[PDB]
Symmetry: D2
Subunit: 168 residues, 4 copies
Amino acid sequence: YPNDKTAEYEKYANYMNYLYYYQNNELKKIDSSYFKDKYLGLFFGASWCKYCVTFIDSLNIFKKNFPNVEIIYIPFDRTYQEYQSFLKNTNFYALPFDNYLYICKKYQIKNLPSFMLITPNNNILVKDAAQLIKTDEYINNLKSLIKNYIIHPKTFQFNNRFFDLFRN
Amino acid sequence: YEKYANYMNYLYYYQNNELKKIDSSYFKDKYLGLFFGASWCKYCVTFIDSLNIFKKNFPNVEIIYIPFDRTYQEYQSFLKNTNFYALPFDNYLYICKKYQIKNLPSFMLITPNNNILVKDAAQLIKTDEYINNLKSLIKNYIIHPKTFQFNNRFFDLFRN
Amino acid sequence: EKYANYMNYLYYYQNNELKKIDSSYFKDKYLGLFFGASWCKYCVTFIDSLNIFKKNFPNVEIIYIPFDRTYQEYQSFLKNTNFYALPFDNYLYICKKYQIKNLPSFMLITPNNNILVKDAAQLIKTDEYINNLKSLIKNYIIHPKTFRFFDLFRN
Amino acid sequence: DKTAEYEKYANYMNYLYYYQNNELKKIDSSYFKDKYLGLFFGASWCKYCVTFIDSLNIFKKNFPNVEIIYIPFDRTYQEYQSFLKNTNFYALPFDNYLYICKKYQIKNLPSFMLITPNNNILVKDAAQLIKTDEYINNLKSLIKNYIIHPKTFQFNNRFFDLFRN
């Protein structure tokens, strides 16, 4: 009751209200509610890291086999210029350009690239999916994992899935 | 054929400094942890402590050693310092090919119906942070029963 | 041309105060560049291997290249370690130069800024490496160079 | 009786193998005296080792006198042959080389190790090194600057020393 800082906390209800993507030469926004109830693939990467650039071929093959999983780029670029040139050469959504070490701390991400597969209720279906997707042996078994894994509904703070996923 | 019908009909273990065998049908309907390793590889020997802590946390998962020892005597000395089950001493590169196993140790978590629950579990179980995530995977993954060729889940799991 | 301004001091904690050292102290020394962060548990567990490395190679100066998110996290790291550190800043440009893609990473650098061991973090986790590294140090001819951190981190 | 068997190892690894014209050829191991070597631990059934060949070809272009030797972990002679025909590397004869993995604690395929003429390890984890563009000038400096102190190999057999603890 004393020293209630709900007022301060409430700013976070609009955290990550948009993701970004390229269409022709436009950096466009998409309302993050679009990702409600979707499986996500979180791609931790940077345009300056050659391994992350070669990894895009594996992600593109993954996307062809798992078209309903949405790929979200979590950038570790140095400038907007680097971020924008990379995003325009991909079919991915992205977090806005920013410093995301706090997400690395939450999931103990220690390598670029890293790729994690996330269920609609923000559980981790595959922690180390970057390794998983560089051969093609994974496809049938990942389809079984997605088909068979029960999704128990959760309540996200402020009804904000990305606040839950990246902060809580 | 004939030894298709008898492929992997027993797994092996040590007890009281004696090599023993168990009907492999005992592993029907069990979660398995396939431990790819070798006694010559120091990273595999230290990994035994992570597996033992894993087993304490997940006691219904059966740990099966898939050996890459050079000699039967090295295999035996390794198996006697563990309480794991093991495939018979043999050359298992065909299993490495099937699953694209490229590192020792590797550890794969398998459901009762031979699906892969966690492909790269060695790195998962050396941390502190995996228990609740793995508990949820096991509790949430629906098991549809399967019948296996030659009535032998290891024929399916290792040879298709 | 304030390249003269670049990396004039490294930092460290001693007697619970933040101190600085002129970067010319590191001229002609073997260096161990430790890319790390206090938020990364694997970097924190790696400090024990670095301390054992330092006991066996006391003349190699370990330099911490930070990837902490905040200045307070960086200071807490310095208070708990015995390395010299770059000032708190964003060092992705060094990661790009050397294609550092993992934390921790550890690189061993000769007095004239050549790379003696590119991927030394896995090397020093064991203690199998010690004789091999002693031979590399003993046998690597040094051709002296006039300048060191602008050459090492930018070129 | 078998102190004579121990002497047999003076002829250990007397030939390496390679393919030139879909044709299997042998080369006297003495060709490799005083050479730097790149030991490539790999297997044709391992997709990561197949993709690694691209990095080894860039390495061979930039370091043509570092002789690449394939240490096989193929299941069958035919897998070994097909791999060798497509990479025209030198190779140990098809066999089981777990004892080499024990000596050097090789735990990943592919692995690649750079060896000096006196059998010291110049770069232990060279598979990681050569996947980047950046390594070339500093590896040339490392080869140019590392002093080679002469050693005596048992039976004057370099590969016996390099592979057999």
